[PDB]
Symmetry: C3
Subunit: 163 residues, 3 copies
C-alpha cells in the first residue's frame, strides 16, 4: 500500500524493561503520517523497542534493512552523552554510505532552538536501499528533526531507489 | 610552471561510457583558472574521467597523489544518494587526514541556495601533500563550492607544502 | 576538591623542544578558571606539552583518561593542515564515542569570526568518562571555542558522569 515503508526504532533501557512508557514513538509515527504527502506517500509499518545495547540495535537495523526492506528507519534515543547511549556507534557499524548533510541540517536547525542540541551525537546513512537516521529521544525532537529534513527527504528516498 | 598543480576527476558511468559529453569537467577547469590569482597561482594541469566504481576512483586519486604529486584534486559527481554514487567512500579509503572544515563550509553555503544541498555526501581530506575535495556533478555546483572555499583555499595549500 | 578535573595538552614541536614558549596554554587555563561556575565547578589540575608525534599524543590522552581519570581534556594545536599536525588523528584513535555537535558548534561560531576557521580539523569525543576536545593553537581560539561550548559544556560533563 505505502509507496515508502518507514519503521521507527525506540532505543531505551527504561522503555524496554517495561518500567516506563514510550512518549516519543507515538509522536514520530504521528509526524510521519502528517507528513505523508510531502514525503511522496509514506507510512510507518513497524515500530520496535530495544534497550541501550549495541548488539540489539545492530540486529534490528540489519533485519529491517536486509530482510524486511524498509525504506526509512528513524531511531529515537541513545544518541546523547550518557555512558549507555550507543545508538550512533551501532548505526555506524551497519551503514555503508554516510549522509552527513542530513546530520548537518538536523544540527543546524536544532541549535536555533537550544544550544543543548550540540549534545546530540546523531549518525545517519544508507544500508542497501535503506535510509537510516538517528534522532533524539524527546517527543518534540522528532518533529523538529523531521521539519528540517522534509524539504529534501522525498527526493532522497526517490534517489536511493532509481531516479 | 604553476605554483599549485590542480587536477579534476569527473565521475560518471555515462561520461566514461562515451554516451554523453562531459558537461562539468571543462566548467570546473575554467573556474579554477579564473580563480588562479586568488588561489596563490593554481592551475588545472590534468583531468580524467572514471565511471562510478570505487576501485577506479581510488586508483586515480592514489596515482595523482602518490606519483604525479598533484597539490589539489577536485572530484565531480558520484556524491549523492543514487546506488552507484560511491565517490566519498572511495575518497575516505585514500585520505589520511580529514578536513571537515571544508565540508562544513560547502554544506553551509550551498544550503543557503537550496535544501537539496543536504543530499551531497561529499568527503574531503589530505593524502600525502595532496588536498582532495569531493564536489557535486552540477556545472553550477563547482563554482558555488569554489566561491565558498576561496577565502581560505590559498592558505590551505600553502600550509600543506 | 574540584567537581570536574580539567587537563590541558599543548601540542607543538616548537614548545616541546624548548625553542619557544606556550602562549595558548595559559589562556586556556585562564578561560576554564574564569568559567568555573558556568562549567559546574571546574578547575585545570594538570597541563602538559608534547610534540606533534601521534604516539606521544595518544599516550597522554590514554593516561589522562584511563589512569588520572580527568573529566575534560582540551588539546591545543596540531589540528591544522601542516604536515606535522596530527592531533585529530591521535584523538580519533583514542575516543570511543564521537561528539560531532561540539565540533559543529566550534566551527559554526569560529567561521563568523574568520573563513580561516575552516582550516581547523578538530576532533572530539568520549573515552571512558573523559570528554576530549581538540582546539587550535591560537590563544584567542580557546576563548572563542570555549565561549561557543559554554552553554552546554556543564550538562555534557554531568551526563558522562
Amino acid at each position: 500500500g505505502p509507496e515508502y515503508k518507514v519503521a521507527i526504532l525506540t532505543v531505551s533501557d527504561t522503555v524496554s524493561a517495561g518500567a516506563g512508557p514510550d512518549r516519543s514513538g507515538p509522536r514520530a509515527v504521528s509526524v510521519v503520517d502528517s507528513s505523508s504527502e510531502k514525503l511522496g506517500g509514506a507510512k510507518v509499518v513497524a515500530t520496535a523497542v530495544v534497550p541501550d545495547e549495541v548488539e540489539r540495535i545492530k540486529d534490528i537495523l540489519q533485519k529491517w534493512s536486509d530482510v524486511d526492506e524498509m525504506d526509512l528507519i528513524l531511531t529515537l534515543g541513545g544518541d546523547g552523552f550518557t555512558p549507555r547511549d550507543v545508538t550512533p556507534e551501532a548505526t555506524k557499524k551497519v551503514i555503508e554510505r554516510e549522509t552527513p548533510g542530513l546530520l548537518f541540517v538536523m544540527m543546524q536547525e536544532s541549535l536555533k532552538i537550544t544550544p543543548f542540541a550540540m549534545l546530540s551525537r546523531s549518525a545517519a546513512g544508507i544500508r542497501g536501499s535503506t535510509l537510516i537516521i538517528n534522532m533524539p529521544g524527546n517527543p518534540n525532537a522528532v518533529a523538529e528533526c523531521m521539519e528540517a529534513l522534509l524539504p529534501a527527504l522525498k527526493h532522497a528516498l526517490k534517489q536511493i531507489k532509481g531516479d
